Structure 1
Amino acid sequence: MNSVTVSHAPYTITYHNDWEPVMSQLVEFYNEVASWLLRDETSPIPDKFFIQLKQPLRNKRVCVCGIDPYPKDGTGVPFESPNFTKKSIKEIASSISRLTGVIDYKGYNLNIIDGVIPWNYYLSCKLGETKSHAIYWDKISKLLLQHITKHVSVLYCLGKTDFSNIRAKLESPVTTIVGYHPAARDRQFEKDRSFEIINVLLELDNKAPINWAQGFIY
């Protein structure tokens, strides 16, 4: 329910209390960097950069992480495609379809699953250009994900090349799976079994499995 003020837009970052220990450095890092990322039209729009910090962490046990938001139409919620038009979320839905048995669905959202926090490593990109805002988010991205890894039990990063070394230089002993990106060659995400692997790993850490079918929209 709290909010701190930055000096570049969105000027205000409203956050859940679970994010308090980090919010201080976020202001320092953001004010040093914002002017570069605000130069271009961004995905998402700046008023949506940080709306994911409204999500509690205490109840989360898995983090599903992609490298940066969609090249276009980023909503401020990682992976979200309201009208179910984006490939990655469509492919994620297909895997969960073949796992759970649900075939009749109109959409899928990772932001409505208990114990799961969808996350973008970088929080913005120049419109239509993936990873364009990497060097700008660099410090912030490390800062924020480290805080997430203090709460979650399993970190699931999508993209072998994307999360190549970043997961190792993250500096946490959190169980991590680096699976294929939904856009990978030779149907590698379709063969990918990470969602099944997550639930097995969670049982080892004495945590309840993720009900992946909860993301479905009818």
Structure 2
Amino acid sequence: QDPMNSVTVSHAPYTITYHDDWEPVMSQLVEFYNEVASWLLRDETSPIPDKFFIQLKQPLRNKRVCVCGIDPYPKDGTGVPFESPNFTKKSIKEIASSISRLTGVIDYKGYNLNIIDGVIPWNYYLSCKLGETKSHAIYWDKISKLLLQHITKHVSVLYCLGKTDFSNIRAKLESPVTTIVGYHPAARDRQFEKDRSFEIINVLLELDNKVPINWAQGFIY
């Protein structure tokens, strides 16, 4: 209500609510979202339009990692990337699994990247058409670029899951940032089982005289 702000757009969800940190992008966000929202609102979406932008209420100034997926869960997206509030989606169960092995906690009820101090979970594209992944890529394009640029002004490390999804991510950025492109948790041959991005990020941060990430905080007991 006090760090929070509001701007009004001409298409569902009409009001975008953001944390102060996002201010320099909003003018353009508004403008772009107005040009495309008609077309993209034709389809039913994951998440619902009222959730598209709920991740703009997260502060950026305290953020050192961004853990990025290409788009939301083709079903049941909550508007908070990776979040499965009943701990059912595979990708988040497989991530919880990597971090059980790493930090050695084997008793947990759920896991959420969005509570972990200094991390912002993100979706490159902010909706997909229900059941279909990457369905709204063409709609989100210019916006996705603009938001991710901004995020990388504040984070030390960008961590993108999806080798093929994010093969050419470097192209999307102005100035360079520590970028790591790992495997998707649903990748073939258990390749994410042996992917060690969570440990790698920490070393990278130490090299930037930033404090490591406490991956265990994300557990729900």
- TM-score normalised by length of structure 2: 0.98
CA distance in 2, matches of 1:112, 1:136: 29
- Give the CA deviation at 1:36: 1.3
Using the TM superposition, give the Cα deviation of residue 168 of structure 1 relative to its aligned residue in structure 2, in angstroms: 3.0
**CA shift for structure 1 position 37:** 1.1
Divergent runs of 4+, >6 A:
none
- Aligned partner (choices 173, 177, 180) of residue 183 of structure 2: 180
Give runs of aligned pairs for residues 75-114 of structure 1, distance below 5 A: 75-114=78-117
Supply the RMSD in Å over aligned alpha carbons. 0.6
Q: Deviations over 1:88-127 (max 9, x none)?
A: 0000000000000000011000000000000000000000
SS state at 2:16 partner: strand
CA drift at 1:171: 2.5
Structure 2 gaps, min length 5: none
Q: Supply the distance in 2 between the matched residues of 1:108 and 1:151 (Cα, whole angstroms).
A: 24
Aligned-partner Cα distance in 1 for 2:9–2:169: 27
**CA distance in 2 between partners of 1:185 and 1:172 (Å):** 33
Q: What CA distance in whole angstroms lies between the structure 1 residues aligned with 2:170 and 2:105?
A: 32
Q: Please give the alpha-carbon distance, in whole angstroms, between the structure 1 residues aligned to 2:53 and 2:150.
A: 15
Task: Tell me how far apart the structure 2 counterparts of residues 55 and 205 of structure 1 sit (CA, whole Å).
Answer: 23
**Secondary structure, in 3 states, of the residue corresponding to 1:119?**
strand
Distance in 2 separating the partners of 1:182 and 1:75: 19
Alpha-carbon distance in 2 for matches of 1:11, 1:138: 20
Provide the C-alpha distance between the structure 2 equivalents of 1:168 and 1:7, rounded to a whole number of angstroms.
31
Match of 1:22 among 19, 22, 25: 25
1:148, distance to aligned residue in structure 2 (A): 0.2
**Shift of residue 69 of structure 1?**
0.2
> Could you tell me how far apart the structure 2 residues matched to 1:160 and 1:187 are?
14
State the shift of 1:54 in Å.
0.3
Q: Which moved more, 1:208-217 or 1:162-171?
A: 162-171
Describe the superposition over 1:158-214 as per-residue Cα deviations: whole angstroms up to 9, x where unpaired: 000000113333233110000000011101000100000000000000000000000
| Corresponding residue for residue 137 of structure 1 | 140
**1:149 maps to 2:149:** no
Question: How far apart in 1 are the matches of 2:84 and 2:99?
Answer: 16
CA distance in 1, matches of 2:63, 2:212: 12
CA distance in 1, matches of 2:183, 2:195: 7
Q: What is the percent sequence identity of the aligned residues?
A: 99
Q: How many Å apart are 1:81 and its aligned residue?
A: 0.1
In structure 2, which of residues 103, 115, 118 is the aligned counterpart of residue 115 of structure 1? 118
| CA–CA distance in structure 2, aligned partners of residues 58 and 19 of structure 1 | 10
What is the Cα deviation at residue 60 of structure 1?
0.4
Partner Cα distance (1:170, 1:208) in 2: 24
